[PDB]
Design an enzyme around this catalytic site. Sequence first.
Site, mmCIF file in Angstrom:
data_model
loop_
_atom_site.group_PDB
_atom_site.id
_atom_site.type_symbol
_atom_site.label_atom_id
_atom_site.label_comp_id
_atom_site.label_asym_id
_atom_site.label_seq_id
_atom_site.Cartn_x
_atom_site.Cartn_y
_atom_site.Cartn_z
ATOM 1 N N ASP A 82 84.201 -35.544 82.198
ATOM 2 C CA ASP A 82 83.526 -36.686 82.862
ATOM 3 C C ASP A 82 84.161 -36.847 84.293
ATOM 4 O O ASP A 82 83.549 -37.493 85.262
ATOM 5 C CB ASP A 82 83.277 -37.765 81.960
ATOM 6 C CG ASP A 82 82.432 -37.699 80.723
ATOM 7 O OD1 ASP A 82 81.702 -36.870 80.997
ATOM 8 O OD2 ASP A 82 82.522 -38.396 79.801
ATOM 9 N N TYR A 120 86.160 -43.968 76.832
ATOM 10 C CA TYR A 120 87.339 -43.168 75.872
ATOM 11 C C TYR A 120 88.566 -44.050 76.049
ATOM 12 O O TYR A 120 89.329 -44.417 74.853
ATOM 13 C CB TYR A 120 87.426 -41.832 76.176
ATOM 14 C CG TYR A 120 85.968 -40.833 76.211
ATOM 15 C CD1 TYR A 120 85.368 -40.685 75.119
ATOM 16 C CD2 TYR A 120 85.833 -40.527 77.492
ATOM 17 C CE1 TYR A 120 84.198 -39.888 75.595
ATOM 18 C CE2 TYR A 120 84.847 -39.688 77.714
ATOM 19 C CZ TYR A 120 83.848 -39.387 76.590
#
Lengths: 303, 311
Positions: A82, A120
Site C-alpha cells: 500500500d 494496519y
Amino acid sequence: NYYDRSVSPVEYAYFDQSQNMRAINWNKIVDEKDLEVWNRVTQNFWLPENIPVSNDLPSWNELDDDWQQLITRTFTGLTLLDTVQSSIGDVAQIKNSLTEQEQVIYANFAFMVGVHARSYGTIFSTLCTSEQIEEAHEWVVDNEALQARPKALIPFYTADDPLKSKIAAALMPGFLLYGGFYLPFYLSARGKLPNTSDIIRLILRDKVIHNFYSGYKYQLKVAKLSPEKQAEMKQFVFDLLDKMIGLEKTYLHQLYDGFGLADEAIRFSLYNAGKFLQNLGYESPFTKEETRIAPEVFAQLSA
Amino acid sequence: NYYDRSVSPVEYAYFDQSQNMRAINWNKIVDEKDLEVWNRVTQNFWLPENIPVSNDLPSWNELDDDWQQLITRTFTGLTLLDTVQSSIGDVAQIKNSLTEQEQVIYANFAFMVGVHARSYGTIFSTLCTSEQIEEAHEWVVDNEALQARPKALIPFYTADDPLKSKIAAALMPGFLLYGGFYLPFYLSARGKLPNTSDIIRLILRDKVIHNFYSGYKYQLKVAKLSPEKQAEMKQFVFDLLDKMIGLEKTYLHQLYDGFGLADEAIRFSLYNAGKFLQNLGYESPFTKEETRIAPEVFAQLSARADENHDF
Ligand SMILES: [Ca+2]
Ligand SMILES: [Ca+2]
Ligand SMILES: [Ca+2]
Ligand SMILES: [Ca+2]
C-alpha cells in the site's frame, strides 16, 4: 469549443505546451462513469479510528505469539504494498488520464491507499507490543521473496509506457494483497479478531473499485489500438501475471511456513487473479479447483 | 535499526536502490508535527454538496449580468489553479519528502485541492447558466495574463530541484488564489452570496495548513544547507515572489476591469504574500499601507469554518 483547443494542466506539464490550459469542468463531463466512481469513493471515506479495534483484545490474547507474529508480519508486508501504491503507483496514473475527472479520482485513490496503510498501524498500536512491530519491519526489509513482488512492478510506474503502468496499477488492488487478506478472514471465520476484519472489509470496498476503474480505463485505451497491438498487450498481461503468481506463491509459502495456510491462501489469491483478468476484459484460465475458497472464508469476503 | 538500512518505496523508485524497501511505520513516528497535520486535515474532510448553496439564489439574482460574469470568471480561474496543484504540484512533493508520513500527507493535499476545484463546480451548478459556465471556461483559456501565473510555477514542479518545487508548492495555497478570494469576502461583507463564503472558508481551512506545512518542510531542509546556499535560496524566493506579484497585478487589473476592486484585491493579495514569506522563515518587506484590508472583509476572511459542514 474551448475544450478542443486547450489542454489540462497535467498534459501541459508533461506532454504538450502548444495550447493554453483549461480548468477542470465538472458541469459538462466526458464520461459519466467518472462521476459515478468519484461519488462512490468520496462518500465511502473512512478512517481507522472509527472502528473499535480494542474489542479484538480478548481474541488476540487467545492467539499464541507465533500467530501474533504471523499477523504482524502479514500486515506489515501488506503495508509495504500500500505504501508503494499510495506514494508511486496511483499518483503516476494522473498524467496518463483519459479525462479530467480521472485525474482527481487517482489523487483520491493515492490518499485512500494511504489510509489503508495507516489502518494496519492502528491495529498494531491497539494490539501489538513495540518489539512485535519492530520485528515485523525488520522481517519485511530482509525478506527477498516479499521484496521481489513490488520490485517487479515499480519499473512500469517509472517507465514511459502508460498501458504497462495501468496494468501494474490494476494488478496491485486486484491481485497482490489477497494472499495476505486470506489470514484475517480465516481468523474471523473462527471468531478471532472480528473488528480487524471490519477494517479489511472497508479496505476491500475501496480496492475493488480501484481495480475496476483501472481495468475500465485500460480497456478504453487498448480498444483503440490495432489487432496486432491488442494481442501484444494481452500477451504482456498474461506473461506478467504468470510471473507475479510465481513470486506470490514463493512468498506465501515462506509467510505461512509452519501454519499450513499457504495452499488455501494461494487458491484465494488465484480466485482474485481471475477477477483481475476479467476486469481487464480477458477470460480467466483458472479452474474451479485452483480457485476454491471455503464457504466460511468466502462469507467474510462477501459481507 | 531496520530504518537506517532501508529506504521508502518512493526513494527506491526514483533515487536509491542500494537497500531494500521498508513499509511505512505509523507506530514509531520521526516527526510528531506530521501526525498533528495528518490528524487535522483528515478530521477536516468535507464535500461541497453538504453546504446549502441554493440559499444564495436570492442575493445572486439581485446581481446584474456583469457581476455574475465576474464571479464565474474569478472562480473558474481559481479552479484552474487548484487543477494545477491537484494534478501536478502536490503529488510532485511526495518523492521529495523528509519523512514517511509526509508522503501520505501530500497525497491527502492533492486529493483535497481536487475537492476545492470540485466545489466551484457545485456553486456553478446551483447559480450559473450553461452559457455563463461555458463563457468563463473560454475566457480562462484565452486570458494570457491568467495563464502566465501557473505557467511560471509548473516548470519548478517538473524540474529536479526539490527546494524550488517546495517553494512553488507553498506559493500556490499561500499566495496565488487570494486576489480571487477577495471577491467572495467583499460580497459577503455586503450580505451577498453568504453560503458561497462558507465554502471559501472550508477551502482556506485546508490551504492555510497546506502553506504552513510546505513552509515547515522548506525550513527544515534549508537549515541543513551552507550559508551561501541559504543566501542563494532566499534570493530565489524573493525573486520568484516579485515575478508572481507582477503577474498577479496584471491579471487582477484585467479581471476586475470596470468594477474598481483591483487595488483593494492587490492589497489583500500582498497581505497574504507577507504571510507566505513568514511561513518560509523570512521577513515581510510590505508596509501596512500596501497590505491594508477593510475590517468587514477581514472579518469574513478570518471567520472560522463551520464544523456543521464537516463530513
Ligand atoms: Ca498499545
Ligand atoms: Ca516464463
Ligand atoms: Ca492447508
Ligand atoms: Ca477601489
